[PDB]
Design an enzyme around this catalytic site. Structure first.
Site, short mmCIF file in Angstrom:
data_model
loop_
_atom_site.label_atom_id
_atom_site.label_comp_id
_atom_site.label_asym_id
_atom_site.label_seq_id
_atom_site.Cartn_x
_atom_site.Cartn_y
_atom_site.Cartn_z
N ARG A 121 6.20 -2.39 13.01
CA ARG A 121 6.34 -1.55 11.82
C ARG A 121 6.41 -0.07 12.19
O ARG A 121 7.14 0.69 11.54
CB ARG A 121 5.09 -1.58 10.93
CG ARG A 121 5.06 -2.63 9.85
CD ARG A 121 3.92 -2.28 8.90
NE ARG A 121 2.64 -1.88 9.49
CZ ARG A 121 1.48 -1.80 8.83
NH1 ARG A 121 1.38 -2.05 7.53
NH2 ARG A 121 0.39 -1.44 9.48
N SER A 123 0.81 -1.22 0.00
CA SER A 123 0.00 0.00 0.00
C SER A 123 0.85 1.28 0.00
O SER A 123 0.26 2.37 -0.11
CB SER A 123 -0.96 0.03 1.17
OG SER A 123 -1.94 -0.98 1.03
#
Ligand SMILES: C[C@@H](O)[C@@H](C(=O)O)[C@@H]1NC(C(=O)O)=C(S[C@@H]2CN[C@H](C(=O)N(C)C)C2)[C@@H]1C
Ligand SMILES: [Cl-]
Ligand SMILES: [Cl-]
Ligand SMILES: [Cl-]
Ligand SMILES: [Cl-]
Lengths: 242, 244
Positions: A228, A48
């Protein structure tokens, strides 16, 4: 610019049994640091994070009319509940509404999409695998270093697109606003093809300095996904940036 | 436009012993709600809320070169320690660096400044009182209704300036961001001419809706300044406009 390897950051990876890389660049001195030069140059599906060039190309081509466009939900089930509603351009980027951007990619088409990825020097520029899925399971690959180069070009309006369109996407990427600093950023998670990769890329503006950043890691299971953000955040905190 | 009184909003003002007004408009300024019809159109000095048109004018005249402009500090004493540093546009807004904006206004000059405020329909459009201080203690005045109209034009890129420059100013005005919730806002505090006035003006995007707002109140002393934010926050929350 320059890059230097900094072994100390490894502590944050080691404690979590994470294989991954952070690249952090200080704009004024054109100087980057990474925990891992080799991994900084390895090229992975953007997933994404591709929403960044795709939104620019959508606007450039007139597929997206402007930042006020609303993408209406047709009522068909989506992979996340968070996508089952009308969205603004910012909202569709920030919740990562793949269905919206697959449609945009279809209207952009192969000829135009190729032309832009070449102009943008975006990764291997390989859009094989179907016009609406190449960034998700096709032949496209990009490194942490390439992501930071790309994001710096966007920041400076040096991409081959109007400044107006660059600003619209900049506007859309804001994720944290504080009195002392502003964060623009985008996540990605490549999960259709091995190996599974989580991304967080963006930049921080603080005082009169700008720091560009790209992070990726191997994702064992969904339970690791917050690292992340939390590993790069911890590094940026330790550096006194955020 | 049309402005409708919401009786229930008064509770929030009388409960704190505050004289003030809030104006809120969903989707457009075509139809707005307020606690007080009369005060909604009453005009006051803009104070630091004038940094919004001044920033747009500075960019449109090329006085501010572009989005990456750094306003360099020459090292000579300034009134506040927070001003004694190089600043970006957003930085100068965040620390309310009036001397940076005064230098912008001087370089813009009275002729250009007058022209833009008239194109923008900005309050009474009166820049009398000295180019560096008309919005602080001169004759310029604007209402809460006119602030929401102005900010709506900015949101839509409909001001008489380039879209690029409107976008640059909007980015510098972000104060809160979440995936489907975004706030742009600016405070001000007018203390040089009585009665003293506090402002908070801005707009909120929530999902696919937008709301424009402007608040002002009489300020007795510095300790009442937070109300500039909490009274309008409570009313917006009553309308379902809830942040994080
Ligand atoms: C109180 C400050 O945080 C600030 C604000 O509320 O925006 C004030 N606003 C301004 C401005 O015009 O930017 C000022 S000027 C100060 C008030 N009267 C004397 C000079 C202050 C820095
Ligand atoms: Cl251009
Ligand atoms: Cl994601
Ligand atoms: Cl002067
Ligand atoms: Cl002054």
């Amino acid at each position: 610019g320059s890059i230097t390897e900094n072994t100390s950051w490894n502590k944050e990876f080691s404690a979590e049994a994470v294989n991954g890389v952070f690249v952090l660049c200080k704009s004024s001195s054109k100087s980057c640091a990474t925990n891992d030069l080799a991994r900084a140059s390895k090229e992975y599906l953007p997933a994404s994070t591709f929403k960044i060039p795709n939104a620019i190309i959508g606007l450039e081509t007139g597929v997206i009319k402007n930042e006020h466009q609303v993408f209406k939900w047709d009522g068909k089930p989506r992979a996340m509940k968070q996508w089952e509603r009308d969205l603004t351009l910012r909202g569709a980027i920030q919740v990562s509404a793949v269905p919206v951007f697959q449609q945009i990619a279809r209207e952009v088409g192969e000829v135009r999409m190729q032309k832009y990825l070449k102009k943008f020097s975006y990764g291997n520029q390989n859009i094989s695998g179907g016009i609406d899925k190449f960034w998700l399971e096709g032949q496209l690959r990009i490194s942490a270093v390439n992501q930071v180069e790309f994001l710096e070009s966007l920041y400076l309006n040096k991409l081959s697109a109007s400044k107006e369109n660059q600003l619209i996407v900049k506007e859309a990427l804001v994720t944290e606003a504080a009195p002392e600093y502003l964060v623009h950023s985008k996540t990605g998670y490549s999960t259709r093809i091995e190996p599974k990769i989580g991304w967080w890329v963006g930049w921080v503006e603080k005082e009169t300095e700008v720091y560009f950043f790209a992070f990726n890691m191997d994702i064992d299971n969904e339970s690791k996904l917050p690292l992340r953000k939390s590993i790069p955040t911890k590094i940026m905190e330790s550096e006194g940036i955020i």
